[PDB]
């Protein structure tokens, strides 16, 4: 009956930010104290909630979104931000009620020669809506000529590899992000901290 936060945080490999994973958390008691009382997280920003109280509230549903981005891009995982990640990969809403948790994962997600697993979307015509997920690999038409599914000039693959190398500057190293959003609806609450 304890929420499977370890399945999310301690997962062996994370998803690419363009294809971010979402785990629905329900029918469990949370025990957020394992998270906020850890020295491993370089980022623990909460919005609309106080992290200390978290073991004394209930929410009707909890979502845990996880992905990997650059260290310099963690600042974009926040309400009202812009940039490649917030515009084309993962968009938080302005009234986001939840917490953003990030930590350096250079030891796990970087390979000598470059880790070409983790991708981000570079080309898109419009910004994503909040919590929108776009996994299309359609060739991006940058000019007036149609692409017909063939890469070329003015016709680019929309995804790019980070190529995480262990010797990158810290801002260029991979960071694992977990975004908890807390739902409050007119329905029974099925996620609660231990105290309540």
């Amino acid at each position: 009956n304890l929420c499977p936060f370890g399945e999310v945080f301690n997962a062996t490999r994370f998803a690419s930010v363009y294809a971010w994973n979402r785990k629905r958390i329900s029918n469990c008691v949370a025990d957020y104290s394992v998270l906020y009382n850890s020295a491993s997280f370089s980022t623990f920003k909460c919005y609309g909630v106080s992290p200390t109280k978290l073991n004394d509230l209930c929410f009707t549903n909890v979502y845990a979104d996880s992905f990997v981005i650059r260290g310099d891009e963690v600042r974009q995982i926040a309400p009202g931000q812009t940039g490649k990640i917030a515009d084309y990969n993962y968009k938080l809403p302005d009234d986001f009620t939840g917490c953003v948790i990030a930590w350096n994962s250079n030891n796990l997600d970087s390979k000598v020669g470059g880790n070409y697993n983790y991708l981000y979307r570079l080309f898109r015509k419009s910004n994503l809506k909040p919590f929108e997920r776009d996994i299309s690999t359609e060739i991006y038409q940058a000019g007036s000529t149609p692409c017909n599914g063939v890469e070329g000039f003015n016709c680019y693959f929309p995804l790019q590899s980070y190529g995480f190398q262990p010797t990158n500057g810290v801002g260029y190293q991979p960071y694992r992000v977990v975004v908890l959003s807390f739902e409050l609806l007119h329905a029974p609450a099925t996620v609660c901290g231990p105290k309540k």
């Epitope: 812009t82 080309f123 419009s126 680019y156 790019q160 500057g169 260029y172």
Partner: antibody
Framework: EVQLVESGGGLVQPGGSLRLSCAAS????????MTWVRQAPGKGLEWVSV???????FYADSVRGRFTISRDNSKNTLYLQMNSLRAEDTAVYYC????????????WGQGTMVTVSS | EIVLTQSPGTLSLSPGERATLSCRAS???????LAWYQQKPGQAPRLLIY???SRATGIPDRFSGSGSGTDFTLTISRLEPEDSAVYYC????????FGQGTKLEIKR
């Protein structure tokens, strides 16, 4: 044939305003990262601003709050609105298409001269 | 910010020789975000290399870029008179900054 044709350069008194245009052909401005890059007489290149296809904009520290990058899809034209111009804004300004990791600044305009002087 | 310093400031080499131009960053950049441009007199900059080692369209194999971390190099073998220009390095990962330039003069 891919072409960026710029216009709007001229003489302004300090504190005055100017607006540059970059008419594109062979490139859909609204679908690209579009940048302005300037070069003061005798010096190197300095990035000015960028506008994303989705509409996000970013500016260099030396021009933020005074410059505004924008576009008009119907004319396929990039714009740079310059306000509160100072003598150090005197430069040849270039518009460039930006492909980032897929190719950097691959297409450049011919440039227009901007002179801020009393 | 990331500051790119190019060395040397001026080069004077004979045709057919090889030119080695350096770009040094104040902090390490991913090679995926480095670029080299050539600017001939009275002309707009022309992209030579993107991503450290990748040649732009129409750029001959005579130009080759390399480097990692804080150090990147542009090499122009078999120099010709029309290689006389100013060469700029650029990074576009953390914002966008350019180097001051290296002016290549071709001897005769």
């Amino acid at each position: 044939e891919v072409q960026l044709v710029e216009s709007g350069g001229g003489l302004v008194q300090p504190g005055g305003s100017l607006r540059l245009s970059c008419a594109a052909s062979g490139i859909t401005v609204s679908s690209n990262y579009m940048t302005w890059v300037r070069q003061a007489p005798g010096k190197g290149l300095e990035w000015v601003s960028v506008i994303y296809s989705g509409g996000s904009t970013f500016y260099a520290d030396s021009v933020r709050g005074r410059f505004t990058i924008s576009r008009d899809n119907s004319k396929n034209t990039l714009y740079l609105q310059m306000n509160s111009l100072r003598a150090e804004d005197t430069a040849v300004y270039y518009c460039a298409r930006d492909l980032e990791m897929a190719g950097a600044f691959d297409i450049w305009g011919q440039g227009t001269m901007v002179t801020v002087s009393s | 910010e990331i500051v790119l310093t190019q060395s040397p400031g001026t080069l004077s080499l004979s045709p057919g020789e090889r030119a080695t131009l350096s770009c040094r960053a104040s902090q390490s950049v991913s090679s995926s975000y480095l670029a080299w441009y050539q600017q001939k007199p009275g002309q707009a900059p022309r992209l030579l290399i993107y991503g450290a080692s990748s040649r732009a369209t129409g750029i001959p194999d005579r130009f080759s870029g390399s480097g990692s971390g804080t150090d990147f190099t542009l090499t122009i073998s078999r120099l010709e008179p029309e290689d006389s220009a100013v060469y700029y390095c650029q990074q576009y990962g953390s914002s966008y900054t350019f180097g001051q330039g290296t002016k290549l003069e071709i001897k005769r």
